[PDB]
Amino acid sequence: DIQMTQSPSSLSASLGERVSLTCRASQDIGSRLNWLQQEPDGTIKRLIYATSSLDSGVPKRFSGSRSGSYYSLTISSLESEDFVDYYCLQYAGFPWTFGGGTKLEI
């Protein structure tokens, strides 16, 4: 598997800060990396598809970006209902592996 993994295992910021969570892929995965947001106990919603485009209902505070082999996600100002887990998912490497987690604190 390509084994795209996120570097920050756990982060903590303020309610007005700008978090920057990455996901460093190993092989060439192209622009086929998604971000899945997981509740503390609920299901896992989607944020970004194809590394750039927001979903049909996601707020404006979230935004994706690409930089070489350092696919990342950056929240605008870290409003409420954000200190939850985060995942990066790619569907280029056919085993379809995942990353780790970016459970945010404050």
């Binding site: 060439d28 995965i29 192209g30 622009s31 086929r32 485009s53 049909s56 569907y91 280029a92 490497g93």
Partner: protein
Amino acid sequence: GFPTELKPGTNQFLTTDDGTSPPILPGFEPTPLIHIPGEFTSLLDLCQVETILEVNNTTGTTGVSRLLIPVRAQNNVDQLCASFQVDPGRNGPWQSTMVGQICRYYTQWSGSLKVTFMFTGSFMATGKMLIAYTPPGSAQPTTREAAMLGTHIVWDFGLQSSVTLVIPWISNTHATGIVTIWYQTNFVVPPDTPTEANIIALGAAQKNFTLKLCKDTDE
């Protein structure tokens, strides 16, 4: 012509020659020639036939899904849909076209191409797209309102389901055009209708295409 002196170049074997040789089986009468349909006497007539471009050639996208340009609903206006250089004979989306392969059996070429687009969405789905072409001098335009001041064709696929973008001239002797597809309007559909369609591009070569200096390929 009895006395002759052998000028230089004798006893040499030049492969690319049109010499003569003795028939190793005289008198032999080969099987006669019956009319078989579909003779092609020029590779130009093979180039001028439209075939598909792998415009979606991207890391990860496998199978036939490389021949499809995704045109979806929640792609806001003035956004970019796809772009591909006009270079039949450089590694890219043209590498799957009959022109993109024959042009790799030669060294130089020059002529006019054409890129017929085809919408494959529902009949009820309407909208509009901007298809702009940029000469080799400039670079890829950055915004929709920057490409409208070019050589484009606005495409209302709800009304007419297929257009053609004739490239004026593309010569390879020693910096190539770019074709971009911009979301002019949104993608509007009535209820109970899929909100994601596909565009299929087909490339060819106009009747002014020429080839020169045949050579082997790099597979």
